[PDB]
């Protein structure tokens, strides 16, 4: 279950925000996982993450439950903690399938085919439900892509969230040449 990820700071300004000091494997990757857990009397007390930023290569986080230098004050120097455990098996696809949420697909012709709204598994055939864009060339509301690696679905690039396919916009599309 949880583990130890990070460290809380001293107090910045008077509102509540502190310093943080993650152990994550990187740096920003702490602010991946919630709820978070502070050790207080050597236990784990559940907080929720509200908003962070950056001053001065120095991260400053603040916590709902604080709202004050006090109340901050408290906090300063206990170990944060997040629940790293196993997510619960799924009835259908993978976990890799969320990531794919709300990307743009675009053909090989540069086309935007719209947003990917959801994949949908029919039976044994999975398909990206995409979201076409306002009155796109073709007339076409919404599309039904194929998630097949390498004949439909090129590449995967979650760094722009953009999906790549060799999939035809419409029956007049012209072609490379």
Request: hydrophobic fraction near 40%; charged fraction near 25%.
């Amino acid at each position: 279950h949880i583990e130890v990820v990070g460290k809380l700071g001293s107090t910045y300004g008077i509102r509540g925000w502190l310093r943080i000091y993650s152990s994550t494997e990187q740096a920003e990757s702490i602010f991946d996982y919630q709820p978070w857990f502070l050790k207080i009397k050597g236990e784990w007390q559940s907080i929720e993450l509200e908003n962070w930023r950056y001053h001065n290569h120095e991260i400053i986080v603040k916590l709902k439950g604080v709202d004050d230098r006090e109340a901050a004050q408290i906090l300063a120097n206990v170990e944060i903690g997040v629940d790293l455990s196993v997510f619960p098996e799924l009835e259908e696809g993978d976990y890799y399938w969320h990531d794919l949420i709300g990307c743009t697909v675009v053909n090989l012709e540069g086309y935007t085919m719209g947003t990917v709204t959801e994949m949908m598994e029919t039976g044994s055939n999975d398909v990206l439900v995409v979201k076409a864009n306002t009155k796109d060339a073709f007339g076409k509301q919404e599309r039904l892509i194929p998630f097949l690696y390498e004949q439909v679905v090129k590449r995967v690039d979650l760094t722009t969230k953009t999906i790549e396919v060799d999939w035809d916009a419409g029956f007049l599309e012209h072609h490379h040449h």
